[PDB]
RNA sequence: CAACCCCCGCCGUUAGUUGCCAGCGGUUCGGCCGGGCACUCUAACGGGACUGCCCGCGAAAGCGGGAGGAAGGAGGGGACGACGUCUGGUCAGCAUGGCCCUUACGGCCUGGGCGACACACGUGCUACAAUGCCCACUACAAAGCGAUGCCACCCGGCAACGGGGAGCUAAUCGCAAAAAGGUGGGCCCAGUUCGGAUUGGGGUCUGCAACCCGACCCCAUGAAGCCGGAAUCGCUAGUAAUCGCGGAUCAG
RNA sequence: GCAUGUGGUUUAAUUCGAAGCAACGCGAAGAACCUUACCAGGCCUUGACAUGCUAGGGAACCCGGGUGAAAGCCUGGGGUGCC
């Protein structure tokens, strides 16, 4: 984008719950546009949360996201003929995106067989503040104030 | 196109497989369209002057 | 499975027909 | 669960199992169960000793297998080989036989890559 | 039940030609189903612009064979009069089967 | 009440008859013509828009395109017929934008390319 | 696994040329370009010279080599 | 440059052997028949956006936001490449100055070769699998091509194919099955029911002829390969990714 | 791993061009003979194609046989119009 900030695509809320956050997540599981498949994944992963936890998956989902949003990050920069990691306050937009993504990238790395399953567990261990979803979160920050020796750029 | 092969590729062969095309105009052999019987270059060539009827320039 | 010229897709790919993909 | 030739395919389905045998492919197996009535779905370990034998007796006295197949081919090769047959030569040279190209992708018949020097 | 097929290359040439059959058919005949389009079949030609070698060139040529139909039911010897030898289009081919 | 719903090369014959509340498409139960289809429910949205679910029947036909498009196709049609019943309905419809139709059409494959955009890859430029 | 349906091929050039060498017993040298041809059980024992791209390769035929063609004995590509 | 021209999206007129109980009568309940052009459609012409309206910024041009509208500010996509640049490419398409051969640097043919392989790079295809593979039942597409050509259907065969034979001159017959998808069931994380290389073997067809050097089918064989060094490509929306279909050339 | 283009090496020949971006599934939208320009061997010359000239013989034409890998070479027949 050179000329403008470019508008942000607006999505259609979920047919089930109705939260766009949902639709956003699903989009992220979907590969090859088999959105009918990824739809299921999410739902059946929800149903797993019902049977395995006394809580509404809708809530569980948000709180899980809420917890992996890193509020601090690195962004390399060439000053002095060198790569200086400048830590920086991440914007709202970029959090939500980084969350959902990591939730997924992490999920598919689980030892578990069935996909929906992998999501299910990742969605829980997330809200409990663990797993890897949150680890891929704490690690970035473990760089944020790790090189905070440079927050003057 | 060598005359030695235009006029040649025209006389009936001892085997039907042996019979290939050539462009009636240029004598080219590599890629003539049956429909017109002209070398791809040739097709364009006339296609342009307007010598191939109904033959317009596609647009969609 | 697309190179497996003895499977479903195997044939569908090559567009050939055989003991694996028939004519109904 | 044992021996067909000298082999022991086990703990899995029959149909699957039999594949393991040099002479049997996803075809014969099915056409060796259809000729015996043993239900494929059942594992090897849960076969009736009697069921087993039938399979045995059949398969062994019909198709050419391990201890004999590897043989027929082997010599079969030496056949045209002993003869000045082109096809034989390709076999000597360890190159493609069926007619492929010897400029690029051939590696499957040459094995590892043998890099040499050149120019620019 | 005179079936009149009209195949051509120019859509105006046929329109007129087709209209010309519509007009002198209602004056001496009876109830005409009007002119109807098909379909229309195209003949694409993907040729390389330059004669030398530039795959990425390619000029695109088409050839539209328009199809028009005009049905005439209750064919009189009077209708066949006006529609006997009263034509004018050149790049139009007609064929009748009744 | 007919309206006409067309979407990405696929036509939808829409018929709204005051009934109990059932959709028959190309002769089959709505929910049978769309098994396993997640966004299926999507068709009826224009209805639950005016709290008019179950008051009409839906004799719907459809031709062309894909099932995962025809959905939208019906969706529009229903909407277009819904004006015939009460034009005053626009007030609650267009804000939600159901009377719009998008040229989401499949772009033409240009030559020199592998698709409508996807160019070919060069390595040592 | 190659195949010529129903009716095995052999050019009449040598067929009715080699058979005539049967009416006399044996010969010594045969030369004909048709390497298009299959070898027949009716052809065994002769010493046919086949054409390469420039040479004329002599080929002795065996009781054991009836199912192959002539070309299969005339290597074209000179190598190594 | 823009515009005029085509395709796409709304709508109107003209047109009904495509389309339909949209409304009625019968059924072998197949829109099959009548009957009807309404709808879908088909195609030829024409309407429709111009920042024209409202708020704000602005000297103006214009910019931002809203509304009505199918569509918004060039609505999406085409064709469409200035004066010239690179002594760009191409005399093997054609044409043409010039030099060179004209019993040969010409012409016919048979066979071989363009397919050669210790290697190396370009473009790609198939895959490493469970968001998956297989088998089964089942549903939605467009745009093309078809006379000795597309081949319905029946029969023989595991099958490629073959024998028979109806329809089409093609919106009214055929290529045709779209595939992914959906329902069931099998697989249970293996180098495996992942993968299909290569090799043996047995066949089909084209065609004078498939050794060199053809595709196809069937049985067996079942390799590398468990996601790729440094480096490096494409793509800003119905795009990328994915999935199947069609044609050109052409016996194959 | 395989297809395909190219370098290079090879070959009797492996015909030719294209070369950084702006060559490399590029001419080639179809190499088994053919295509085909290459190499071998066999054969042909006013020549496979145009317009024409001077001398001699024959309507054109058609159907055989010999030799042959084919082409070609040799040979033999019937055959005789319009001015
Ligand atoms: Zn030409």
From Swiss-Prot, chain A:
CDD domains: uS7_Bacteria. InterPro entries: Ribosomal_uS7 (IPR000235), Ribosomal_uS7_bac/org-type (IPR005717), Ribosomal_uS7_CS (IPR020606), Ribosomal_uS7_dom (IPR023798), Ribosomal_uS7_dom_sf (IPR036823). GO terms for molecular function: rRNA binding; structural constituent of ribosome; tRNA binding. Keywords: Ribonucleoprotein, Ribosomal protein, RNA-binding, rRNA-binding, tRNA-binding. One of its GO terms (biological process) is translation. Gene3D superfamilies: Ribosomal protein S7 domain. The keyword tRNA-binding applies. Belongs to the universal ribosomal protein uS7 family. Part of the 30S ribosomal subunit. Contacts proteins S9 and S11. Binds to the C-terminus of IF3 and to the C-terminus of Era. One of the primary rRNA binding proteins, it binds directly to 3'-end of the 16S rRNA where it nucleates assembly of the head domain of the 30S subunit. Is located at the subunit interface close to the decoding center. Binds mRNA and the E site tRNA blocking its exit path in the ribosome. This blockage implies that this section of the ribosome must be able to move to release the deacetylated tRNA. PANTHER family: RIBOSOMAL PROTEIN S7. This is Small ribosomal subunit protein uS7. It comes from Thermus thermophilus (strain ATCC 27634 / DSM 579 / HB8). The gene is rpsG.
UniProtKB/Swiss-Prot annotation, chain B:
This is Small ribosomal subunit protein uS14. It comes from the Bacteria. Part of the 30S ribosomal subunit. Forms a tight complex with proteins S3 and S10, which cover it. It holds the Pfam family Ribosomal_S14. NCBIfam families: PRK08061.1. Disulfide bonds: none annotated. Binds 1 zinc ion per subunit. Keywords: Metal-binding, Ribonucleoprotein, Ribosomal protein, RNA-binding, rRNA-binding, Zinc. It comes from Thermus thermophilus (strain ATCC 27634 / DSM 579 / HB8). One of its GO terms (biological process) is translation. HAMAP family: Ribosomal_uS14_2_B. Required for the assembly of 30S particles and may also be responsible for determining the conformation of the 16S rRNA at the A site. Binds 16S rRNA in center of the 30S subunit head. Belongs to the universal ribosomal protein uS14 family. Zinc-binding uS14 subfamily. GO terms for cellular component: cytoplasm; small ribosomal subunit. One of its GO terms (molecular function) is structural constituent of ribosome. Zn(2+) binds at residues 23, 26, 39, 42. Its cofactor is Zn(2+). Coiled coil: none annotated. Gene3D superfamilies: 30s Ribosomal Protein S14, Chain N.
UniProtKB/Swiss-Prot annotation, chain C:
Residues 1-12 have a biased composition (Basic residues). Keywords: Ribonucleoprotein, Ribosomal protein, RNA-binding, rRNA-binding. Residues 1-24 are annotated as: Disordered. It holds the Pfam family Thx. Transmembrane segments: none annotated. GO terms for cellular component: ribonucleoprotein complex; ribosome. One of its GO terms (molecular function) is rRNA binding. Belongs to the bacterial ribosomal protein bTHX family. Binds at the top of the head of the 30S subunit. It stabilizes a number of different RNA elements and thus is important for subunit structure. Part of the 30S ribosomal subunit. This is Small ribosomal subunit protein bTHX. It comes from Thermus thermophilus (strain ATCC 27634 / DSM 579 / HB8).
Curated annotation (Swiss-Prot), chain D:
The gene is rpsM. Keywords: Ribonucleoprotein, Ribosomal protein, RNA-binding, rRNA-binding, tRNA-binding. Located at the top of the head of the 30S subunit, it contacts several helices of the 16S rRNA. In the 70S ribosome structure it contacts the 23S rRNA (bridge B1a) and protein L5 of the 50S subunit (bridge B1b), connecting the top of the two subunits; these bridges are in contact with the A site and P site tRNAs respectively and are implicated in movement during ribosome translocation. Separately contacts the tRNAs in the A and P sites. GO terms for cellular component: cytosol; small ribosomal subunit. GO terms for molecular function: rRNA binding; structural constituent of ribosome; tRNA binding. One of its GO terms (biological process) is translation. It comes from Thermus thermophilus (strain ATCC 27634 / DSM 579 / HB8). Part of the 30S ribosomal subunit. Forms a loose heterodimer with protein S19. Forms two bridges to the 50S subunit in the 70S ribosome, contacting protein L5 and the 23S rRNA; these bridges are straddled by the 5S rRNA. This is Small ribosomal subunit protein uS13. The keyword Acyltransferase does not apply. Residues 94-120 are annotated as: Disordered. It comes from the Bacteria. Belongs to the universal ribosomal protein uS13 family.
């Amino acid at each position: 984008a050179r000329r403008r900030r470019a508008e942000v695509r607006q999505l259609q809320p979920d047919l089930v719950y109705g939260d766009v956050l949902v639709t956003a997540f699903i989009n992220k599981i979907m590969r090859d546009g088999k959105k009918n498949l990824a739809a299921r994944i999410f739902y059946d992963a929800c149903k797993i949360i019902q049977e395995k936890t006394g809580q509404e998956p809708l809530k569980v989902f948000k709180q899980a996201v809420e917890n992996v949003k890193p509020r601090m990050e690195v962004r390399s920069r060439r000053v002095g003929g060198a790569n200086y990691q400048v830590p920086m306050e991440v914007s709202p937009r970029r959090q939500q995106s980084l969350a959902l993504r990591w939730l997924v990238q992490a999920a598919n790395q689980r030892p578990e067989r069935r996909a929906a399953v992998r999501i299910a567990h990742e969605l829980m261990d997330a809200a409990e503040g663990k797993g890897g979803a949150v680890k891929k979160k704490e690690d970035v920050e473990r760089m944020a104030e790790a090189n905070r020796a440079y927050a003057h750029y | 196109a060598r005359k030695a092969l235009i006029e040649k590729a025209k006389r009936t062969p001892k085997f039907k497989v042996r019979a290939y095309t050539r462009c009636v105009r240029c004598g080219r052999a590599r890629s003539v369209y049956r429909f017109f019987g002209l070398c791809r270059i040739c097709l364009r060539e006339l296609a342009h002057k307007g010598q191939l009827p109904g033959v317009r320039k596609a647009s969609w | 499975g697309k190179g497996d010229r003895r499977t479903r897709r195997g044939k569908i790919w090559r567009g050939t027909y055989g003991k694996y993909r028939p004519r109904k | 669960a044992r021996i067909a030739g000298v082999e022991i395919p086990r703990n899995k389905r029959v149909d699957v199992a039999l594949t393991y045998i040099y002479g049997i492919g996803k075809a014969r197996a099915k056409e060796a169960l259809e000729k015996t009535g043993i239900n494929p779905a059942t594992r090897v370990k849960d076969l009736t000793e009697a069921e087993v034998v039938r399979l045995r007796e059949y398969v062994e006295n019909t198709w050419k297998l391990e201890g004999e197949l590897r043989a027929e081919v082997a010599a079969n090769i030496k056949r045209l080989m002993d003869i000045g047959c082109y096809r034989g030569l390709r076999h000597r040279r360890g190159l493609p036989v069926r007619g492929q190209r010897t400029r690029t992708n051939a590696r499957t018949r040459k094995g590892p890559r043998k890099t040499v020097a050149g120019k620019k | 039940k005179i079936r009149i097929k009209l195949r051509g290359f120019d859509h105006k040439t046929l329109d007129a030609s087709a209209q010309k059959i519509v007009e002198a058919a209602r004056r001496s005949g009876a109830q005409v189903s009007g002119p109807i389009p098909l379909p229309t079949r195209v003949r694409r030609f993907t040729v390389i612009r330059g004669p030398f070698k530039h795959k990425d060139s390619r000029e695109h040529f088409e050839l539209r064979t328009h199809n028009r139909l005009v049905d005439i039911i209750n064919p009189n010897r009077k209708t066949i009069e006006q529609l006997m030898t009263l034509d004018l289009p050149t790049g139009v081919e007609i064929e009748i089967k009744t | 009440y007919y309206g006409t719903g067309r979407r990405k090369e696929a036509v939808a014959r829409v018929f709204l008859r005051p009934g109990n509340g059932k959709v028959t498409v190309n002769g089959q139960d709505f929910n049978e013509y769309f098994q396993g289809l997640v966004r299926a429910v999507a068709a009826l949205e224009p209805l639950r828009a005016v709290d008019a679910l179950g008051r009409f029947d839906a004799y719907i036909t459809v031709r062309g395109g894909g099932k995962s498009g025809q959905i939208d196709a019906i969706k529009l049609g229903i909407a277009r017929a819904l004006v015939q019943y009460n034009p005053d309905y626009r007030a609650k419809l267009k804000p939600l934008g159901f009377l719009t139709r998008d040229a989401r059409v499949v772009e033409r494959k240009k030559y020199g390319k592998h698709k409508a955009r996807r160019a070919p890859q060069y390595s040592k430029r | 696994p190659r195949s010529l349906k129903k009716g095995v091929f052999v050019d009449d050039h040598l067929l009715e040329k080699v058979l005539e060498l049967n009416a006399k017993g044996e010969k010594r040298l045969i030369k004909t370009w048709s390497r298009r041809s299959t070898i027949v059980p009716e052809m065994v024992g002769h010493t046919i010279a086949v054409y390469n791209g420039k040479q004329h390769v002599p080929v002795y035929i065996t009781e054991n080599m009836v199912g192959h063609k002539l070309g299969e004995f005339a290597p074209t590509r000179t190598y190594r």
